[PDB]
């Protein structure tokens, strides 16, 4: 299909810092791939980002009920919607499945199926932390409310050497430890 | 920061395809099915602890269609430049023989939000057991999407993810097979 396409996106972004202490609303209108106009609660009015957005920022700012409604939305909408799903979003905890395996020479630590994305993975060689030669895939979001990470250790293991992968996550009270002997 | 909740909607012409969805830290809470005019929760649990009135979502889409038609004229009919996707095939967990797993096709950094994704099991299209997500938003104003294929790790099987997008000249085929 070679026919031209015209796309319009509307986004309301509620950004929460220290629970619901500080909240910020961001209304963004995007024509094709260029954001044209926006309402930032920290500013208090519609602002044109591109020339295309100038009639809208001008039009929407002339409507007092809009500016009234949008200035209060951090409480009526953002703080409301955060409470609506707090127990299964903010309070969601899924314990990761930790697996250590060699993949040549590299020693892989697979941490999968966890929630939230906030994780710490530490490698150890005979009880001592090995910070150098550590390479991660980063945090992989699988799109089903679980994450995964792969934390590799560049090492040519000597016999008798015990490698340890230590994982720390909000889901567990104490760190998850997986051992691997050469 | 700590958390971000996004109400993301789009309308696309001439396709006449709209979308309304909620995102919590990148992950879809729900979307509104435009045909069935009803709320589709990402995980069933969400439907048991929270509720939604989809007519508000469908009223927003009518306005998005109306505003797209205004912007189309205003921009002197400037169309979208196709941005082709970055395709990645990966598994949900480390692969073990005969242990059920899920193959993920991550289609990222693309626009407009229109793709054909097909899973191929030994060259033939597997149209059964598959699932997908809606077009998820990005900060660069492009889309991301995921396609899933629950499978049983085998030594005698090969998989491919076939992605077709208008920004690509030929289909993008991403391979996966069990190693060692």
């Amino acid at each position: 299909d070679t026919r031209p396409r015209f796309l319009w996106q509307l986004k309301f972004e509620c950004h929460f810092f220290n629970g619901t202490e500080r909240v910020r609303l961001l209304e963004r209108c995007i024509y094709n791939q260029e954001e044209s106009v926006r309402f930032d609660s920290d500013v208090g009015e519609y602002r044109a980002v591109t020339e295309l957005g100038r009639p809208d920022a001008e039009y929407w700012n002339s409507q007092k009920d809009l500016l009234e409604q949008r200035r209060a939305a951090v409480d009526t909408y953002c703080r409301h919607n955060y409470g609506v799903g707090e127990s299964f979003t903010v309070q969601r905890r899924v314990e990761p499945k930790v697996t250590v395996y060699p993949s040549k020479n590299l020693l892989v630590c697979s941490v999968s199926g966890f929630y939230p994305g906030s994780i710490e993975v530490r490698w150890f060689r005979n009880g001592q932390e090995e910070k150098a030669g550590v390479v991660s895939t980063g945090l992989i979001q699988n799109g089903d409310w679980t994450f995964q990470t792969l934390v590799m250790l560049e090492t040519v293991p000597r016999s008798g050497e015990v490698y340890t992968c230590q994982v720390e996550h909000p889901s567990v009270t104490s760190p998850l430890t997986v051992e691997w002997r050469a | 920061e700590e958390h971000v909740i996004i109400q993301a909607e789009f309308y696309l012409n001439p396709d006449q395809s709209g979308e309304f969805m909620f995102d919590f830290d990148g992950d879809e809470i729900f979307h509104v099915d435009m045909a069935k005019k009803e709320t589709v929760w990402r995980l069933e649990e969400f439907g048991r602890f929270a509720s939604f009135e989809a007519q508000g979502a469908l009223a927003n889409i009518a306005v998005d269609k109306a505003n797209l038609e205004i912007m189309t004229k205003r921009s002197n009919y400037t169309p979208i430049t196709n941005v082709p996707p970055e395709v990645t095939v990966l598994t949900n967990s480390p692969v073990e023989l005969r242990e059920p797993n899920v193959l993920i096709c991550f289609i990222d950094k693309f626009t407009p939000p229109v793709v054909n994704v097909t899973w191929l099991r030994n060259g033939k299209p597997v149209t059964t057991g598959v699932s997908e997500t809606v077009f998820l938003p990005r900060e660069d104003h492009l889309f991301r999407k995921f396609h899933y294929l629950p499978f049983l790790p085998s030594t005698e099987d090969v998989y491919d993810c076939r992605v077709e997008h208008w920004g690509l000249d030929e289909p993008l085929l991403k391979h996966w097979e069990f190693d060692t």
């Binding site: 209304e27 929407w60 939305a73 | 909607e9 909620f22 509720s51 306005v63 912007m71």
Partner: peptide, 13 residues
């Protein structure tokens, strides 16, 4: 509890 929709606004004609 119910998720709230923020109403889209009609653009400059």
């Amino acid at each position: 509890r119910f998720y709230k929709t923020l109403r889209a606004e009609q653009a400059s004609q």
